[PDB]
Amino acid sequence: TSGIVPTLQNIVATVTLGCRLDLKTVALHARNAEYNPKRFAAVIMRIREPKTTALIFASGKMVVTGAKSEDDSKLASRKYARIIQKIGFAAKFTDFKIQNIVGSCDVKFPIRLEGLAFSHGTFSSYEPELFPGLIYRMVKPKIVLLIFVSGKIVLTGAKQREEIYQAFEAIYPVLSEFRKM
DNA sequence: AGCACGCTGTGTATATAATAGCTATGGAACGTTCGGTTGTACATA
């Protein structure tokens, strides 16, 4: 009905290697590594070809983020593991689970936020002197939507690409019902 | 050099994994500092 498909903007994927790393060694022998143990307990590393960031912890756990596609995250995570391998550490690609997907879109018309905040009060929270966007907590699929007056919708919380589409197709009608003017 | 205006970073809201470090918060204990004369017998000269 809508005819517009939301576009994914970020994918937070987590990977494990099953081995203990020495963060200082990784920071000193990796191209772009930023290890500051005083603030955080991981070495932050970036690569350019998929443009993703990785938080590599001392327990062999990795948190890749920034990929725009489900497969691109796999390529980024694989390259990060390979870089760790080329250092010499025992690193093997292992369980890869996408823990969060963020998508954005626009319905192309203003939305009366005061309406959703009133009609849908059990899901929507509208406190406009803190954040200019209404927060809709959909119950099935369990996804959080940020609805803005300019007609822009942000989808976050989906674990697969299907739920983020399902949420938008279920939110378009109630959004159109509250079109200003 | 002070005032108006543009640009840029910071905060606030949402989801999520990972980790280590500090904070509350009850529960238990120990140490220091406040609220004779009188009168009658008796035995002997």
Side chain identity at A64, as an amino acid letter?
A: V
Cα separation, A28 vs A92, in Å, equals 21
Cα separation, A178 vs A94, in Å, equals 47
Q: Could you give the 3-state DSSP secondary structure of residue A146?
A: strand
Please state whether strand B lies within 7 Å of residue A61 at its CB atom.
yes
Element (H, E) at A166: helix A161-176
Which one, of A103, A95, A51, lies nearest residue A73 by Cα? A51
- Experimental method reported for this structure: cryo-EM
The contacts of residue A42 (CB under 8 Å, 6+ apart) are A23, A35, A55, A56, A57, A58, A63
Taking the CA of residue A21 and the C1' sugar atom of nucleotide B31, their distance in angstroms comes to: 49
Please state whether strand B lies within 7 Å of residue A94 at its CB atom.
no
Please state whether strand B lies within 7 Å of residue A41 at its CB atom.
yes
Question: Quick one: resolution in A?
Answer: 2.9
Please state whether strand B lies within 7 Å of residue A139 at its CB atom.
no
Domain residues of chain A, as ranges?
1-12+99-181, 13-98
Nearest 5°: phi and psi at A88?
130, -15
